[PDB]
Ligand binder design. Structure first.
Ligand SMILES: C[N+](C)(C)CCO
Ligand SMILES: C[N+](C)(C)CCO
Ligand SMILES: C[N+](C)(C)CCO
Lengths: 304, 316
């Protein structure tokens, strides 16, 4: 009993250390966009003279967004959308091109890197009002609708979006721009699934020299990362995982691991539900690892 | 009796490996907590550097006043309650003419007009500002061995993020031990200033104390040792915060932490004071910092586990 416990407790600690590393990685975009939101809300917060604390034009705000992309290579992008006439009169900017404005002048910049890496901007006019469901079960405008409805930060499950002519699966990290209790807009950043897959492959290598495999499962059950096969990213976990596993995914409470042994295959399954800063999201790190890679010392002792 | 030697060594190994795993988990949580202030102030730097970066037309990408930059700093304090403060210093005449501001009080300016705001919370929790005029140019060694202006001198010298070992500063009439998280404000390859935020040692101590209560049910202790060997945290004794780890450790321990590779664990077993010590050095992002987590476990607690392990094995 006690020996198996001490071995199991090592396994869980090492897995917990990797959850913490993934959390650090996934909390970073939210902290970045929190900063932009805490600066941009000052456009609508009066100071001692009764005028906004920050008197930045739209071009200066976009400069902040562009600087974010330039100086955070791990972020796929940075984007901001204001409510209609949130901080100025949309109609005065309608028809101005190349600045991220909707046709009616709404402020909707999406900044990302062109082919040569230099930041470019697109208006989000097409997606910001779209409530259509993307192929991964995510509402097209969820990155904006979620902060608007909840007035809190939102991390969005994997969804495909077209970026410079290619389809990129990504997850968004979003914070509302609040002036008092008024939702004025939202600012966010995406991480690509390719980036997060690379993170999870690194994490899995730290567990018994990569003897096992890991999966990162979003709140809707779809795969953010899956070290076994890059082709499964964005798929329902139920379409990759064996019945034993997709069952245990429903047996989970945040921060409490679930530990199981698949008898037919002789491996350990470890499920570590976790959350990310103030986003309220519940993702799950799953570890699948052969018993032999973990319990060799027990085996050695029983050999004596 | 060889078998007994082989069996005991193997039982000890499983215990030793578990504690190493717990130390790695604790280091990973510490890294998560300590990366956060650097990301915040990187955002401040990435906005403020726009005051000197040219746009398409030549004029600067951000035309914001000192008041507006201070509003960004105040907003950071207000909205980041884990942070003790937020502060920024510009080179002389970095983004404007200091002399136009010389003499103006209550805005965080030096006597000569240099921009040097230090924003923190008053007793009512609302942010207030102090100029860093007395510290920004002082290389005096503070009681913890840190230069008074290291928070600025290190980003200036190295042009990269800097995390500073514990140092005391007067805030609101009281001496507070803190560690700063600093980044340079670069326009191109030119240092124009730096921006930073402090965490109090009280905050880090509290973190480590809460974690120690989950290690052998609080029976042991933890410490965090800064790059110069002084205590960032020490769960046993609040009064050692800032003190040399060598002052509270009876072995050769702190000396050959210098010789230990980042992310390599090292046990030091002292049967004489009944202590098992585990050191795990680590770094934080690209700061270059070298801090060490220490776990201290009563030997008798591990001795007791070995007995139960040995017995359970003998029973079956
Ligand atoms: C990709 N958008 C920027 C359009 C939304 C966030 O994923
Ligand atoms: C919306 N207002 C700017 C009027 C309130 C600020 O708190
Ligand atoms: C306390 N200061 C802000 C003066 C320096 C950073 O520790």
């Amino acid at each position: 009993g006690l020996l198996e416990k001490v071995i199991n407790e090592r396994l869980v600690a090492l897995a917990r250390a990797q959850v913490s590393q993934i959390q650090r990685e996934l909390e970073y975009p939210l902290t970045v966009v929190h900063g932009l939101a805490n600066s941009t809300r000052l456009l609508g917060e009066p100071g001692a003279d009764g005028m906004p604390q920050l008197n930045a034009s739209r071009d200066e705000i976009s400069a902040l967004l562009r600087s974010t992309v330039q100086n955070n290579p791990k972020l796929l992008d940075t984007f901001m959308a204001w409510e209609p006439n949130a901080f100025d009169t949309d109609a005065a900017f309608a028809g101005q091109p190349g600045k991220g404005y909707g046709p009616d002048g709404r402020y909707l910049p999406w900044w990302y890197r062109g082919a040569d890496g230099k930041p470019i901007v697109e208006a989000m006019a097409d997606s910001i009002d779209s409530e259509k469901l993307l192929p991964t079960g995510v509402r097209e405008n969820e990155f904006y609708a979620c902060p608007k409805e909840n007035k809190r930060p939102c991390i969005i499950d994997p969804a495909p979006y077209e970026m410079g002519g290619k389809t990129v699966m990504m997850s968004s990290f979003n914070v509302p721009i609040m002036v008092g209790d008024q939702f004025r807009g939202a600012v966010g950043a995406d991480l690509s699934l390719a980036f997060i897959q690379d993170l999870l492959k690194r994490a899995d290598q730290q567990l018994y020299d990569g003897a096992g495999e890991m999966a990162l499962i979003a709140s809707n059950g779809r795969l953010v990362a899956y070290t076994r096969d890059d082709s499964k990213l964005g798929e329902p976990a139920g379409s990759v995982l064996d019945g034993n596993e997709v069952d245990n995914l429903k047996n989970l409470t945040v921060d409490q691991p679930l530990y199981d042994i698949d008898a037919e295959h002789g491996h350990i399954e470890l499920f570590l539900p976790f959350t990310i800063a103030d986003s309220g999201v519940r993702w799950t790190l799953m570890l699948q690892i052969p018993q032999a890679a973990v319990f060799g010392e027990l085996q050695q002792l029983q050999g004596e």
